[PDB]
Amino acid sequence: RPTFYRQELNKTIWEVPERYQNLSPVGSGAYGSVCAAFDTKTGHRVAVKKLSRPFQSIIHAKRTYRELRLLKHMKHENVIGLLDVFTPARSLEEFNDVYLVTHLMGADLNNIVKLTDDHVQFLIYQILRGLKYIHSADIIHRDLKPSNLAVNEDCELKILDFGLARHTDDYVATRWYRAPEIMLNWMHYNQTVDIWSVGCIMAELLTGRTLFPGTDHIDQLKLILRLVGTPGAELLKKISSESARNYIQSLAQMPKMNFANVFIGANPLAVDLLEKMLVLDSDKRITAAQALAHAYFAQYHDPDDEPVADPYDQSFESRDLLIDEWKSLTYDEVISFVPPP
Ligand SMILES: CCn1c(Nc2ccccc2Cl)nc2cnc(Nc3c(F)cccc3F)nc21
Known part of the structure; x- marks a missing residue:
């Protein structure tokens, strides 16, 4: 040993x-x-x-x-x-x-501020390919932001579970990249919360600026609505929270801006894709697999090398166990680990 x-x-x-x-x-x-x-x-x-x-x-x-x-x-x-x-x-x-x-x-993607459209295509393509995989195991990341995306000088990209709060030598708020439907509660959402975050990231790679830099969760919604517009009846009717429904509606008129305007200069295929990722209604936002088939990625998309994951058992998440139980289970996973070749 x-x-x-x-x-x-x-x-x-x-x-x-x-x-x-x-x-x-x-x-x-x-x-x-x-x-x-x-x-x-x-x-x-x-x-x-x-x-x-x-x-x-x-x-x-x-x-x-x-x-x-x-x-x-x-x-x-x-x-x-x-x-x-x-x-x-x-x-x-x-x-x-x-x-x-x-x-x-x-490095992390945030540091890549220290890109051509081909660069954006390749980075966002890789995020989506990793997300197809994660999402296929019924895992939701829920806090994708540039500091959770590890990148080489090669431009190869890996999604991290958690990034760094402090680097050695040597800021990125979750809410800037969080989907509107999870901004106040967790009652109605699916894997596409991650797709919203991808849109926010992709927007920032194209523009050099944080898309929705809200000062808090209420201001975040205000910056979001200014771009996507106030929702109509079809979305308002799916919101359970009286508080949330009321802030979404209580705005000095919010026009859906022209992504064409907001992102002028960009590949129109990028703007199209952004428009499908940054959809307010969780139930109508594009999935990772759909986004990968988007013509924006025609240089990179190969359906035969965009794999899905094995089945993942998430049942433990519902459990309330004692410290020593979790500890023994953890130890089991440690002992049984088999390294990749
Ligand atoms: C969050 C740090 N982090 C982990 N964490 C981790 C997660 C799961 C299992 C084991 C670990 Cl260590 N793996 C990383 C690989 N590469 C680098 N690069 C890197 C750097 F060198 C400087 C600044 C930012 C970075 F992303 N960071 C890593």
């Missing part, structure tokens, strides 16, 4: 197999911290995440289990998956730390 070493990196002790060398902080978040490392087995560079306090509560414990489950499942070129998972623990009884290893990508 591997020999582990210890190293202190900004007040966190890291304990990793000797295989991973040259640990270099990349950043941190509320759910963990991440280093770059060199993997001597493959001669490639990887990212290593040390989960922060994985079993400190039933909510940490459930999150820890979710992340491991989800990441073991993801096997697609445009979705971050697991190269490795490890713990210094030699038994369940000493199990209190979880480390996850993936490809190092070296």
Whole structure:
């Protein structure tokens, strides 16, 4: 079994197999911290995440289990998956730390502000291809924003589950990229909430500006409505919340702007696609599979290399278990891990 070493990196002790060398902080978040490392087995560079306090509560414990489950499942070129998972623990009884290893990508899409239409085509194509895969397993991301999209200098893109709150060397609000139907509650929505976010991102790649930079959830709705217009009866009748129905309607007249105007200069096929992604009504927004068949992506679309995922068991999400139950289940997933070839 591997020999582990210890190293202190900004007040966190890291304990990793000797295989991973040259640990270099990349950043941190509320759910963990991440280093770059060199993997001597493959001669490639990887990212290593040390989960922060994985079993400190039933909510940490459930999150820890979710992340491991989800990441073991993801096997697609445009979705971050697991190269490795490890713990210094030699038994369940000493199990209190979880480390996850993936490809190092070296930047997030937000940093790509530090693009031709072909560039936008390729980036958005890859997001949609990863989303086809995720969505096919009945997984919804629910917080897609540029800081959750890992990108190489190659322009290859992988969807991350969680990005960095702080980078080392060295801001992106969820609500800017969130669909209107989930802006106040979670009562009526499906996988297309992710498609809205894609539209927001695609808009920002085309224009260099945040599309809907709301100062809060009410102002977010106001910026959104200014562009897509006030909804008519067919959408207002599907809204249950009296509060939501009232803000959506209580506006100094909001005309559906001409995406033609808003995005003048763009490939008209981009504008068309944007118009189908940024549809207010969740039930009529284009899906990832439909968006991939859009003529905007004719340079890249190949239906024979846009795979779907194996069946994913999300039943645990309904469960309310004890910390030690989640911990044992997590440990099971750790022990059973089989690395990719
Ligand atoms: C959120 C950090 N992060 C993870 N997290 C993760 C997720 C699931 C399982 C294991 C990990 Cl480490 N994997 C990454 C791969 N590549 C890079 N690149 C990179 C960078 F080097 C600098 C700034 C931004 C970046 F995206 N970041 C990663």
